[PDB]
Design a protein around this ligand. Structure first.
Ligand SMILES: O=C(O)Cn1ccc(Br)cc1=O
Length: 165
């Protein structure tokens, strides 16, 4: 199971970890991907998860987009977790760098409530441009299911823990 996590609330846990390495170790039922609406897994968490699947996540995602069209910002889809998890929940948080609406971050986190337990990154953090402290606050105030947050950057992990209200 999940180990070495710091408990933030009744249902939110956090660890300084590479989510790919965490997924390979725990083999969770659900790993959350920081997806974009096109499921183009180029960089950040998406690029790293996709590379760990030997591009199988991207091939599967391109078939999903060909059939269904793009996701909405704030939306999600459930696809295979390949060698990382039973399922991958591709969640689209708003990308501030692309001028997307930051109020959609709460809608993005609501997707986590459809899964009892998840391994996840902070939505809209990193290359998505949002304030990670604000993302963690929205996470704790929105997600009611068991979420295990993997924060890649040590300095950010330390700041998130020390500033947590
Ligand atoms: O650490 C993360 O999980 C995401 N991330 C990565 C690197 C930096 Br710097 C900021 C940030 O939000």
């Amino acid at each position: 199971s999940f180990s070495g996590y710091l408990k933030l609330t009744d249902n939110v846990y956090i660890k300084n970890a590479d989510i790919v390495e965490e997924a390979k170790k725990v083999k969770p039922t659900v790993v959350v991907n920081a997806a974009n609406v096109y499921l183009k897994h180029g960089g950040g968490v998406a690029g790293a998860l996709n590379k760990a699947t030997n591009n199988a996540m991207q091939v599967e995602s391109d078939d999903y987009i060909a059939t269904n069209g793009p996701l909405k910002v704030g939306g999600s889809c459930v696809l295979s977790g390949h060698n990382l998890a039973k399922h991958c929940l591709h969640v689209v948080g708003p990308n501030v760098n692309k001028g997307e609406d930051i109020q959609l971050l709460k809608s993005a986190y609501e997707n986590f409530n459809q899964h009892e337990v998840l391994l996840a990154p902070l939505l809209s953090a990193g290359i998505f441009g949002a304030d990670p402290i604000h993302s963690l606050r929205v996470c704790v105030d929105t997600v009611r299911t068991n979420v295990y947050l993997a924060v890649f950057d040590k300095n950010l992990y330390d700041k998130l823990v020390s500033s947590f209200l």
